């Protein structure tokens, strides 16, 4: 029996485990670390990826330019050097995007008129949000229906306000410029269902959005979050408004913490990060670029003027940020400052840092200070998350970029304390024993302050590769192939990793192409064909599809498909195929002496493909083994159909026969056809017409189409009959066969067949079995030995089965065979039928082409027409490689005054 101590041990254990779980729950709600899983951006000078931003920052580049000339601004009237002159700007320089007007409207399902009415902030947020999710290695379509939240800093800049009122039945003018819709439209178009909020606290807006997103994630309200801000100056209003105040730097430069600092330099930017609980990123296998530890927001309160900063409030928000995540100021290596280059604000910011991080600071490790604004200017609502981008890029590349224009630090700050040093040059910042951390500040003119703590992320052959690319237009398809071509021309390039990334991290769009390749060089050759709109090589296939799934039929033909060594490659390259073959030989064992595997390999002393009694069991094994290979790639038949003994493969695949019983039926039937050797013939060819012609004789096996038919009978009549058709018109192709099937010649063997095979026990079919004998869907239990004799005996109504299935809504027809013998007849029948007019028909292997590459090419052909394939099964052990983002096909949309 249990002592009192043994029982107390269990109760006290439960109480301390309850406590531990409660404490963990508190710490999740309060301070759960948040993974930055990816980033995206549009910044001045064509800086349209985070890597380009890093490239700019590592060189010390400054992207300042003249005012745009393609936005309808009146540049002559707009400039005037006197600050007090109404309606003008004394600066003519800013940070402007390359192509603020460019948008791929059709990609996003937006009409041309809606696009023109849309604020470019909204349009570039759609592109960057798509890129953002692609850069996380996530198929954006997989976020449809998820609780992904959207948290954006965005304000109106007057787009469209000086355009003549027009008609607008659809209300495009209202939704096109509303900041609420800037966030809501991302949710709408990507099918996101978490909260979607636009916020405005001026310059701190995007870090306030980040603070709210972190809250939403810690509470479990959002599963992931799209976070950032957008500022595109559609009108010059901000240069005019701030000119009246002499608030702008005359040369346009943001000289943060330099003695030259003399006002703002304003810029455009659209910057986003994707956030998730770190523990959730690890669970889901998402990359983690860095971690948000903590953040704080407060207000200046009663400052010396509405828009004046408050040193004491900045001190407090710094301390609150560090305290919210349990860190000390000494834990922080560097600050990405608000750093606007104003003469009043730079000293107050620096003094607040000197008084928090700089107090009692390790003499050998001052706080590093800089500002991305010195490179790219002040991106307004996007400013805070833009500084976060720099921090993450600096962490990932092991280096703190220089901040510009500090050759003389401002003398309005007493740097003598020595606790804070400006990044006058780049500084190594390598992963090591000391955990790397940095902070980002943003302090808005409405007085709301943000400080966020960011930490490094926690320490973390020659076979055929199917490469699948897709896009929403043909031009975008060519671009996507050309981008992958360039990627694979690199040495860094992991062929299999690229294929797996293409298959699992990218949305599958309507225009689709695929290359099956074993080397990078072959892959590039095939992708270059796609990039030119061609598909001439055999390893390249293209199509277009409006659906992403099909109702699939597996078709199993009879004889005619075989060829010497068929499937031999697949024994080595495909365990699924060989496993099924081996299973076939175990069940064929107590009925024959030879082995199917030995025939396919063409072993020594192994039978050849001339004896009906070896061909049919081989082809059966090949077919049911190709069926299993298709099924391991995720292609499940919704129905099966067989032609003559192909029905036996069909019935096994459907589940109606065990493999033991199907082997009996095929070996049984196949020997008994050997008996009738030399005693029959068959040949090919309308049904009613051919039956008139056959009255003179008493020797019709199959109806494959309205002009394709098979006649069977005695050798004599066979030739006599051909002479007539010979000396009259259409051809009569013989058939390599020693016998005459589906004719009365069969009756003599009825008795033995049935007794030999009468032992079988058919089961219910798990997959619709549409009989070509009785022209209907049949319960598997009806498929007893009597049925299998009636299949040998009666006429194969193949075309009618296809037709019936086309007309019932099946739209993918897969010939599961080593060589395509019914594809044409299926195609013709599907066309004439009142069934789907976009059906697909494909085979499995070809006489020349029975290796895994040919099989992958067949699956590719099915896929570019909408059959879903699990391509990762082809790429075991690969890791997904980072890819370029979607090649948007842009036109200009701009409402002009």
């Amino acid at each position, epitope marked *: 029996m249990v002592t009192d101590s043994e029982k107390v041990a*269990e109760y006290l254990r439960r109480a301390t485990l309850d406590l531990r779980a409660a404490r963990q729950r508190i710490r999740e709600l309060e301070s759960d670390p948040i993974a930055i899983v990816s980033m995206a951006c549009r910044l001045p000078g064509g800086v349209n990826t985070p890597q380009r931003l890093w490239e700019l920052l590592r060189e010390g580049g400054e992207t300042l330019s003249g005012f745009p000339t393609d936005r309808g601004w009146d540049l002559a009237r707009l400039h005037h050097p006197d600050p007090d002159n109404p309606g003008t700007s004394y600066v003519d320089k800013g940070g402007f995007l390359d192509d603020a007007a460019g948008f791929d409207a059709e990609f996003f399902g937006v009409s041309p008129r809606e696009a023109a009415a849309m604020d470019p902030q909204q349009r570039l947020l759609l592109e960057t949000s798509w890129e953002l999710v692609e850069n996380a290695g996530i198929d954006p379509h997989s976020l449809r229906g998820t609780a992904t939240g959207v948290f954006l800093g965005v304000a109106k800049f007057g787009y469209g306000e000086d355009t003549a009122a027009a008609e607008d039945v659809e209300g495009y003018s209202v939704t096109g410029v509303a900041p609420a819709v800037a966030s809501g439209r991302i949710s709408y178009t990507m099918g996101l269902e978490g909260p979607s909020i636009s916020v405005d606290t001026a310059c701190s807006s995007s870090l306030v959005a980040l603070h709210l997103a972190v809250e939403s994630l810690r509470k479990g309200e959002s599963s992931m979050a799209v976070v950032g801000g957008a500022a595109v100056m559609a009108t010059p209003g901000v240069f005019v408004d701030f000119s009246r105040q002499r608030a702008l730097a005359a040369d346009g430069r943001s000289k943060a913490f330099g003695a030259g600092a003399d006002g703002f330099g304003f810029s455009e930017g659209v910057t986003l990060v994707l956030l998730e609980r770190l523990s959730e990123a690890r669970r889901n296998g998402h990359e983690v670029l860095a971690v948000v530890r903590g953040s704080a927001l407060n207000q200046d309160g009663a400052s010396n003027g509405l828009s004046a900063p408050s040193g004491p409030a900045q001190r407090r928000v710094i301390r609150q940020a560090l305290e919210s995540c349990g860190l000390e100021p000494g834990d922080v290596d560097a600050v990405e400052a608000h750093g606007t280059g104003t003469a009043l604000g730079d000293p107050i910011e620096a003094n607040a840092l000197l008084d928090t991080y700089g107090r009692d600071r390790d003499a050998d490790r001052p706080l590093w200070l800089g500002s991305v604004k010195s490179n790219i200017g002040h991106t307004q609502a996007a400013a805070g998350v833009t500084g976060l981008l720099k921090v993450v890029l600096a962490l990932r590349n092991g280096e703190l970029p220089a901040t510009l224009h500090v050759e003389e630090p401002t003398p309005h700050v007493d740097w003598s304390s020595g606790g804070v040093a400006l990044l006058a040059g780049n500084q190594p910042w390598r992963r090591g024993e000391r955990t790397r951390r940095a902070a980002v500040s943003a302090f808005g003119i409405s007085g709301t302050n943000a400080h966020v703590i960011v930490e490094e992320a926690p320490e973390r052959d020659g076979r055929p590769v199917p490469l699948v690319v897709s896009a929403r237009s043909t031009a975008a398809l060519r671009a996507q192939a050309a981008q992958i071509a360039e990627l694979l021309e690199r040495p860094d390039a992991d062929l299999a990793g690229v294929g797996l990334g293409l298959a699992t991290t990218r949305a599958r769009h309507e225009h689709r192409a695929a290359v099956v390749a074993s080397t990078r060089e072959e892959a590039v050759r095939g992708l270059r064909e796609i990039a030119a709109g061609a598909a001439t090589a055999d390893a390249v296939v293209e199509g277009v599809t409006e659906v992403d799934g099909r109702n699939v039929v597996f078709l199993f033909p009879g004889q005619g498909s075989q060829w010497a060594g068929m499937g031999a490659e697949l024994l080595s390259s495909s365990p699924v195929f060989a496993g099924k073959i081996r299973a076939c030989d175990e069940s064929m064992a107590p009925m024959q002496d030879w082995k199917v595997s030995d025939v396919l390999r063409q072993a020594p002393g192994a039978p050849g493909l001339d004896r009906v009694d070896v061909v049919q069991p081989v082809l059966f094994a090949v077919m049911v083994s190709l069926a299993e290979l298709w099924r391991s790639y995720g292609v499940e038949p919704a129905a099966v159909v067989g032609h003559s003994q192909g029905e036996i493969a069909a019935a096994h695949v459907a589940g109606a026969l065990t493999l033991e019983d199907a082997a009996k039926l095929v070996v049984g039937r196949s020997r008994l056809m050997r008996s009738l050797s030399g005693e029959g013939g068959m040949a090919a060819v309308g049904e009613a017409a051919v039956r008139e012609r056959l009255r003179p004789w008493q020797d019709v096996a199959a109806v494959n189409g309205p002009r394709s038919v098979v006649v069977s009978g005695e050798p004599g009549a066979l030739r006599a009959f051909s002479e007539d058709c010979a000396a009259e018109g259409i051809r009569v192709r013989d058939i390599d066969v020693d016998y005459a099937s589906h004719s009365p010649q069969i009756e003599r063997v009825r008795e033995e067949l049935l007794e030999t095979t009468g032992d079988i026990a058919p089961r219910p079919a798990r997959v619709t079995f549409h009989s070509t004998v009785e022209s209907r869907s049949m319960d598997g239990t009806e498929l007893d030995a009597r049925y299998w004799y009636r299949n040998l005996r009666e006429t194969v109504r193949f075309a009618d089965a296809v037709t019936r299935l086309a007309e019932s809504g099946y739209d993918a027809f897969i010939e599961v065979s080593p060589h395509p013998v019914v594809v044409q007849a299926v195609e013709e029948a599907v066309e004439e039928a009142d069934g789907a007019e976009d059906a697909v028909v494909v085979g499995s292997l070809h006489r020349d082409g029975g290796d895994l590459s040919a099989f992958l090419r067949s699956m590719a052909t099915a896929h570019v027409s909408g059959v879903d394939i699990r391509w990762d099964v082809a790429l075991p052990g690969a890791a997904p490689f980072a890819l370029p983002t979607y090649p948007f096909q842009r036109k200009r949309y701009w409402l002009q005054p």
Partner: antibody
Amino acid sequence: EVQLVQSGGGLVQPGRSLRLSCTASGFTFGDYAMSWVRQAPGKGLEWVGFIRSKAYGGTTEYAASVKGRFTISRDDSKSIAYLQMNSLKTEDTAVYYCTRGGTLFDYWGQGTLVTVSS
Amino acid sequence: DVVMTQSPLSLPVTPGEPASISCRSSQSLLHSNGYNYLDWYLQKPGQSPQLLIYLGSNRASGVPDRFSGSGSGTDFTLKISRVEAEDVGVYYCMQSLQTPRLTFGPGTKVDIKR
């Protein structure tokens, strides 16, 4: 999260043997006593036996109805508890639950049906 | 000298409304350490048993906080503040003063009032 995954039962003839396993995950298996409890179809829950953790000697106790036929063991490296059932009888037919704890049964496996029939 | 518990044989309940299950032991379950050695379990139909309450009135992590227990000595109650339809099944009060427990007993069959 805590999991107790049970396997190894099914149909067995009288007089024969079966070994049930309970594979634990998400906690330190070696710190817990583990118990077996069974439920004949449509009846109540009957205690079968239990094994102590190594911290308390690793020993077992058994209901008188199974003593000398059933034995419990554990593998702390694989985090598995076993119920070895010999000389099975028709009245042993039951769903067999593994549970964490010898006194407080704070987490239960999904159960394994054992049917003894000729 | 064997320690048994008894609870009502059946108990119809109404979702939205409270429910109480009483338990009486043949012997005080109050230990010198101050706790009553009485635990409550639930077996939902076709599911395995689950723990609800331990040592009389402690609710295990993850159990819905509509469940509580009280009592002392020989008399105990499991209370559901507002019954849900998913709460039907068999409730068991189990003493832990004397071990092993050979049986869980007949328990209290909770079903929907009508």
